[PDB]
Design a protein around this ligand. Structure first.
Ligand SMILES: OC[C@H]1O[C@H](O)[C@@H](O)[C@@H](O)[C@@H]1O
Ligand SMILES: [Ca+2]
Ligand SMILES: [Ca+2]
Length: 410
């Protein structure tokens, strides 16, 4: 094994080297390149990765600085986050319409929310501020044309009605909107965010994407079947994101129903995704060559989001932290690949390095996931998410409401 994680100082050093190796994939700060994106998209044969994964990377580094105190990459991350905001400061840049799902926009909004929660340095005064960007994403996702009567509500996966997949009302789109609403409620103390989060969670429960008996979290269903054709694939990020949002709602509301939802979602996650203490991407990891570029990132979110749950729902700490520890130990045990002696693969539970080429990418998602898992071992030393009591960001009461906003020509 190359990386050591047995003391705070060892973890910090390992995380620093992991942050270096992940950054080698990113070219957006170099002359002639586009800030905020990993190489791609694959539809243009420019690389393996889609736009939303750039937003996931940005948030990973906002958390990296929060967890380690190392600000080395903060300027690069601010540049990337600001470049992708779009003309209406809502994470809907039109050049990316083909990638404009509610999930894709949501991941960028969640990185902005994280920047506000983590007191990440503010953009210049003339540029959109982190809380305002999160508010803009949430507001566009709450807009009435995104909430029709099919399946008695819920967001569709896609934003443009002509995009393939507009007929799929899926967990991830709704989970992003739910999580943002819960987090905006806690930060701002505005109850309209919370009422929307409650409504969307109740919809996810009613439609049966949350199993009423087992608290498994399924993938979605299609409007032409009234959402009854449930795709029962269980992706780790879906259950983990609902757990994260539920923990914010428990912290904000102190309503026992939210504590019960945290506990039930957590029981399900530990049962389904942790195998002898190691996170496992059940729909695809059982054999090599099946996980997509997107899926290689999910286990990193699981680690980072579950670590935050222990801060805002502290009664969960002893159920979560020991399991994140065994999972991160498995992550580092397999970061031994050539040519560096420390290259990271995906198949942590297996105990062996597998070249990312088996899954047809250069390996950025695997690197991101290990960075997330190792950094998050420092959660016990980190501050909890800030609210507006101590945060430094600024909001915008008209976030998402510009006259040139896309909702005005839907
Ligand atoms: O990567 C898994 C992910 O794939 C697509 O985005 C959709 O099918 C989602 O519903 C699913 O969660
Ligand atoms: Ca998309
Ligand atoms: Ca490829």
């Amino acid at each position: 094994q190359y990386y050591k994680i047995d003391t705070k100082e060892e973890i910090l050093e390992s995380a620093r080297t992991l942050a270096y190796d992940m950054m080698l994939f990113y070219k957006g700060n170099q002359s002639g390149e586009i800030p905020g994106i990993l190489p791609g998209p694959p539809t243009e044969h420019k690389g393996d990765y889609y736009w939303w994964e750039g937003g996931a990377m940005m948030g990973t580094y906002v958390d990296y600085w929060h967890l380690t105190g190392d600000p080395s990459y903060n300027h690069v991350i601010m540049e990337g986050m600001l470049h992708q905001v779009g003309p209406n400061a809502d994470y809907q840049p039109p050049n990316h319409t083909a990638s404009l799902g509610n999930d894709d926009q949501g991941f960028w909004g969640m990185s902005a929310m994280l920047a506000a929660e983590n007191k990440f340095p503010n953009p210049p005064d003339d540029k959109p501020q982190w809380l305002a960007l999160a508010q803009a994403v949430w507001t566009t996702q709450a807009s009435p044309e995104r909430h029709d009567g099919t399946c008695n509500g819920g967001l569709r996966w896609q934003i443009p009605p002509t995009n393939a997949g507009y007929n799929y009302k899926n967990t991830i789109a709704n989970a992003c909107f739910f999580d943002l609403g819960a987090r905006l409620a806690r930060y701002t103390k505005n109850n309209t965010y919370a009422e929307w989060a409650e409504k969307i969670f109740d919809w996810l429960y009613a439609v049966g994407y949350i199993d009423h008996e087992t608290w498994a979290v399924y993938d979605g269903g299609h409007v032409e079947h009234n959402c009854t054709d449930i795709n029962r694939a269980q992706f780790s990020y879906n259950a983990a994101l609902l757990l994260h949002g539920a923990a914010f709602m428990w912290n904000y509301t102190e309503d026992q129903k939210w504590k019960d939802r945290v506990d039930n979602l957590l029981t399900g996650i530990l049962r389904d995704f942790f195998k002898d203490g190691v996170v496992f991407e059940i729909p695809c990891e059982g054999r090599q060559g099946a996980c997509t570029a997107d899926m290689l990132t999910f286990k990193g979110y699981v680690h980072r989001w579950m670590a935050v749950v222990t801060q805002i729902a502290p009664h969960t700490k002893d159920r979560i932290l020991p399991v994140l520890r065994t999972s991160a130990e498995a992550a580092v045990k397999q970061c031994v690949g050539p040519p560096t002696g420390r290259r990271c693969g995906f198949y942590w539970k297996s105990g062996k390095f597998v070249d990312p080429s088996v899954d047809h990418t250069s390996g950025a998602g695997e690197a991101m996931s290990v960075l997330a898992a190792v950094s998050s071992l420092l959660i016990e030393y980190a501050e909890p998410p800030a609210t507006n009591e101590t945060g430094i960001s600024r909001g915008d009461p008209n976030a998402g409401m510009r006259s040139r906003g896309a909702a005005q020509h839907f």
